[PDB]
């Protein structure tokens, strides 16, 4: 709900010359800039300096410097400022240039937030974990006063005493963070119900196809399970962009304001020359629907008749084997169908899982009739059974049974026609075309070409792990930390599950745009390279080296008035 984060950076001579402050600055830069995009009202940041010649803080304790006050919300401009304050401090004390610091922070937190429900944390960047002296009398003192967890980062047993004492405290490496903020990260979207109704088999058409809540639950001739629907797959188109016009200001950076749009209606008076557009009112405009060669404006009462009155439900039509259903029949995005233990009882979860289990064991797909809302589109859909593994309290694996919903095509949807044969080719009349010479050598070399790029060595995602529970990706803090999940990492070798490249590229470039032009005050943008890690996922895989020069040679590859059309 709400959290505070306090950053502390060690400025010892070791941290400066070993380039450990510039590294931590890179993390702070990435962390804060991404936080700036959300501009959360409840996400606090604050920064202090340790072992610093500057002495400016509330408690007037030496060697402590509050370089950035408590800030919420975190804005982009404020982040530009903070990094530049640090960058100036870092450049000054480059060549020619702690215990109480943790105590000052705690006091400043108690005065800032008092006793409000806020997850407080302290993040510390330092090297030489061994070389530091904190007496047991100080650790006894530190645990009592502090109600704030600790995140320690090694940049290169004593330090452990603090971490082990304070509840939910952890320790990470520096390059452990430097690799996390470099690698692509999937966005966590909180699942939201898109449908709520009944999964039915043998329900009465008169009972279900009304706006009445005619309970098929009490129908003993019907299989009725209360179910919910969530989105399983949904298309993304990159970073949302803003339509804007440019404006001037006292500090002329590229300053823009958003624009709105209205819908106007016009007619064309032609004067084959050109026309004279005249804006007219919507009141004098009507929609004319097309029927063949005629266009029709319907009276208002008939315009209502055009809408087919449909009612929310999921009605089973039948079952078939997976292989019996052509894969290309699937035309839409997929959705989860789960049992409704919220609005329904616990019998739904049991009966629903029993259905999925049977469909899994017999490798069956269900054909069903789907309607999400009133007067919504009617869909024929395929219901494919799936497993979803959950991290369990017990050492045993936990598979949650579920269904996947995907739209099947109506009669009016198929565009299929007869295509010319490709294998045993013939003329248009149908006489068998002469079989290609060098035919056996082609199929022989093509077979080696297919083997040369065999990716079977690259493992498919484990059973029940293509989809992932929302619980296994939710964490305590919004700070970019290593996943810590042992199964989630290096499951990324599935060649058919790659990061959203164009989105990462956008974020990567926008970050460097800010770093170079806004912080370093450069006047030339140096756009960075796409990471080799991500390049490989969209580059040809080589299993065995193979020269297709011979194959290409044998294949022989060479580049070469509507104003009376109204009717009734």
């Amino acid at each position: 709900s709400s959290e505070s984060t306090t950053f502390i950076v060690d400025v010892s001579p070791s941290m400066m010359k070993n380039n450990n402050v510039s590294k931590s600055m890179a993390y702070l830069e990435y962390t804060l800039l991404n936080k700036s995009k959300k501009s959360r009202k409840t996400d606090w940041i604050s920064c202090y300096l340790a072992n610093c010649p500057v002495s400016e803080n509330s408690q007037e304790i030496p060697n402590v410097f509050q370089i950035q006050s408590f800030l919420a919300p975190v804005t982009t401009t404020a982040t530009i400022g903070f990094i530049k304050r640090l960058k100036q401090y870092c450049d000054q004390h480059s060549h020619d240039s702690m215990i109480q610091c943790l105590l000052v922070v705690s006091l400043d937190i108690k005065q800032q937030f008092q006793a409000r429900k806020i997850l407080k944390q302290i993040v510390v960047f330092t090297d030489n974990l061994d070389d530091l002296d904190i007496t047991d009398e100080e650790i006894d003192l530190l645990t009592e006063e502090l109600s704030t967890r600790i995140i320690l980062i090694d940049c290169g047993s004593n330090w452990l005493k603090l971490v082990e004492a304070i509840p939910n405290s952890r320790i990470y490496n520096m390059n452990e963070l430097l690799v996390e903020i470099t690698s692509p990260a999937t966005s966590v979207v909180k699942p939201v119900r898109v449908f709520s109704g009944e999964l039915r088999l043998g329900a009465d058409i008169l009972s279900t196809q009304t706006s009445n809540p005619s309970g098929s639950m009490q129908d003993e001739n019907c299989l009725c399970i209360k179910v919910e629907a969530f989105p399983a797959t949904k298309a993304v188109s990159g970073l949302n962009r803003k339509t804007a016009v440019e404006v001037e200001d006292s500090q002329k950076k590229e300053r823009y304001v958003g624009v709105k749009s209205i819908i106007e209606y016009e007619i064309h008076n032609e004067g084959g020359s050109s026309y004279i557009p005249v804006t007219i009112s919507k009141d004098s405009v009507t929609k004319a629907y097309r029927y063949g060669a005629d266009y029709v404006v319907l009276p208002s009462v008939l315009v209502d008749q055009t809408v087919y009155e449909s009612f929310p439900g999921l009605d089973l039509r039948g079952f078939l084997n997976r292989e019996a259903l052509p894969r290309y029949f699937l035309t839409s995005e997929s959705s989860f169908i789960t049992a409704d233990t919220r609005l329904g009882c616990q019998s739904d979860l049991m009966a629903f899982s029993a259905l999925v289990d049977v469909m899994l064991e017999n490798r069956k797909i269900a054909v069903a009739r789907y309607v999400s809302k009133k007067d919504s589109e009617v869909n024929m859909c395929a219901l494919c059974p799936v497993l979803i593994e959950h991290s369990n309290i017990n050492s045993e694996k936990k598979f949650v049974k579920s269904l996947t919903l995907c739209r099947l095509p109506f009669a009016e949807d198929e565009r299929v026609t007869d295509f010319p044969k490709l294998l045993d080719r013939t003329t248009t009349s149908g006489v068998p075309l002469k079989k290609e010479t060098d035919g056996h050598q082609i199929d022989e070399l093509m077979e080696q070409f297919v083997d040369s790029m065999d990716t079977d060595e690259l493992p498919e995602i484990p059973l029940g792990n293509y989809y992932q529970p929302i619980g296994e990706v939710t964490t305590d803090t919004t700070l970019p930390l290593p996943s810590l999940n042992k199964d989630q990492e290096e499951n990324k070798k599935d060649p058919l599950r790659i990061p959203t490249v164009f989105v990462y590229r956008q974020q990567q470039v926008l970050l460097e745009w800010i770093h170079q032009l806004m912080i370093n005050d450069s006047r030339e943008f140096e756009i960075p390279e796409l990471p080799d890690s991500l390049k490989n996922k969209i580059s040809p895989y080589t299993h065995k080296k193979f020269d297709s020069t011979k194959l290409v040679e044998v294949l022989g590859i060479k580049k070469v008035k509507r104003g009376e059309q109204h009717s009734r």
Partner: protein, 548 residues
């Protein structure tokens, strides 16, 4: 853009007689019904299609040179549709018969058409310039006949003149779709029609003259009715180093038809009736100024906006894609690790070689098709189908041997961010702990599931979109002043039948319940099983909630 079909149907004795292969329905009647369905479908699917229908030899007084005109070659319209509808109804009511309409007789010796006049008629028809009708980009002749050996088969010189009449049509881009009809008893010898429809250069040599059984007439018509809608064409890179680059074309097999997308806007003010247009107008929130065409797209980044130059936009995309459409092979993979029914995100495309752009394309994909079939493998592709779109991973799967069309299917693979998270549940107790009770529930479900197998699989043809049907029926009835049959004082039985009439799917659902309901009435212990299964299932449903 604008295709036209010319129905030409030859009359004979066997065309009028009811055939056992047609559920005892006349071949002539089947063609008429197929034509009614054709226009009913195309008015939704491709209304910009011209259809004409002619019969011969017809003894009617209004027939020119023996060729009767049901309706001329015009864009599909309710007036011609009504004409055919009225004819079919005049037949159904027994008001007339097919013999009565075409003035045919069961004498065993009726007049027959001079093919010279027929083929010339086809040519003249496609050359006409009709004012309100657009120019045809595709001209086709649907040729229906029952006569293997007409009178002109004996004259060798007549065949010669006919062969130049046929060529004359091919020169004017007029193509034949033959429907040569053979039965169980009487077969069709295509020897004659082969001669006159053949060409003398390699690829195109005329249309197929292979006969068909009457049982396949309607399906053949409605299949060849459709037109290939080319979705995209781009190079297929197999191995860039050796210029292993080939050409492919992609076709959408299944669209998503929505009602009410086909419309124009009319402005009427007193005695002015004129087409209107929608204009999207952008305003400045500060001044109210029209800034349309003077706007720019930026990336919002907190309280900062970032606009890159076109030159920078180029460099950004350059890291992972090209400007124009392309498909690059990343590797190959087993189909069982690549194709699933639970992660579709888009519609599939059908991929065909494009040897007009790269020669050798046919040889490459034909071999690749053969190999990927043999090993049951697929290709992983990286690229994009349009210039103005993001790239993605694609799955390229070989067409099945059960399918007629030989080529590949293209499935888009979801990015990691396109794979949504599974929702958290309030309870996770699915009753798996109680082994016996749970195993019983699966067993009874399995038995119930057995009574509802789809033995013929899923066919799109069997399910018409109810939204589409409702929409175009209202338009249809209004144009032809057909008063609605809906009554507010509906009997539950009246309402029930209406529902099943308006929706093909609801009709199926009705059968399922009825089979369960006629399973409890029945006193045959075998048939009695289904309903008792359902009762047992409900027993487990209620027992679980009373316990847990």
């Amino acid at each position: 853009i604008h295709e036209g079909i010319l129905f030409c149907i030859e009359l004979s004795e066997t065309m009028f007689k009811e055939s056992s292969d047609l559920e005892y329905k006349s071949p002539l009647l089947e063609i008429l019904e197929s034509l009614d369905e054709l226009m009913s479908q195309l008015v939704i699917t491709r209304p910009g299609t011209a259809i004409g229908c002619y019969f011969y030899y017809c003894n009617r007084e209004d027939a020119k040179e023996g060729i009767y005109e049901l309706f001329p070659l015009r864009d599909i319209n309710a007036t011609f549709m009504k004409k055919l509808n009225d004819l079919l109804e005049d037949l159904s009511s027994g008001r007339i018969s097919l013999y009565d309409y075409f003035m045919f007789q069961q004498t065993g010796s009726e007049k027959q058409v001079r093919l010279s006049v027929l083929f010339t008629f086809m040519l003249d028809t496609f050359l006409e310039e009709i004012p309100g009708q657009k120019q045809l980009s595709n001209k086709r002749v649907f040729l229906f006949t029952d006569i293997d050996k007409p009178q002109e088969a004996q004259d060798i010189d007549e065949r010669a003149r006919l062969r130049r009449l046929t060529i004359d049509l091919f020169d004017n881009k007029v193509n034949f779709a033959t429907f040569f009809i053979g039965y169980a008893d009487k077969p069709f010898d295509n020897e004659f029609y082969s001669d006159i429809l053949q060409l003398g250069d390699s690829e195109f040599d005329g249309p197929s003259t292979k006969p068909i059984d009457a049982k396949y007439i309607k399906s053949r018509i409605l299949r060849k009715k459709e037109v290939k809608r080319i979705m995209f064409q781009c190079p297929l890179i197999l191995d860039e180093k050796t210029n292993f680059i080939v050409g492919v074309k992609g076709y959408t097999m299944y669209t998503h038809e929505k009602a009410g997308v086909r419309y124009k806007l009319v402005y009427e003010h007193e005695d002015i009736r004129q087409e209107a247009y929608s204009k999207r107008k952008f305003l400045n929130p500060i001044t109210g100024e029209d800034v349309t065409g003077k706007t720019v797209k930026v990336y919002p980044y907190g309280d900062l906006d970032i606009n890159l130059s076109d030159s920078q936009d180029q460099i950004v995309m350059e890291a992972y894609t090209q400007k124009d459409a392309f498909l690059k092979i990343i590797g190959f993979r087993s189909s069982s690790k690549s194709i699933h029914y639970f992660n579709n995100i888009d519609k599939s495309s059908f991929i065909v070689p494009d040897e007009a752009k790269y020669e050798g394309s046919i040889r490459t994909l034909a071999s690749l098709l053969k190999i990927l079939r043999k090993k049951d493998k697929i290709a992983i592709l990286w690229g994009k189908l349009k210039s103005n779109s993001h790239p993605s991973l694609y799955t390229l799967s070989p067409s099945s041997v059960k399918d007629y069309n030989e080529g590949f299917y293209l499935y888009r693979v979801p990015f990691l961010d396109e794979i949504r998270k599974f929702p958290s549940l309030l309870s996770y107790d699915d009753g798996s702990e109680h082994k016996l009770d749970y195993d019983n529930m699966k067993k009874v479900t399995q038995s119930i599931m057995g009574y509802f197998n789809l033995r013929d699989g899923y066919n799109p043809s069997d399910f018409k979109n109810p939204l589409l049907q409702k929409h175009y029926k209202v338009l249809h009835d209004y144009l032809l002043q057909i008063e609605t049959t809906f009554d507010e004082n509906e009997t539950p039985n009246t309402k029930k039948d209406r529902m099943m009439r308006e929706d093909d799917s609801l009709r199926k659902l009705y059968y399922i319940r009825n089979k369960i309901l006629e399973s409890e009435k029945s006193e045959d212990p075998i048939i009695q099983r289904l309903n008792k299964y359902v009762k047992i299932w409900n027993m487990f449903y209620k027992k679980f909630n009373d316990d847990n």
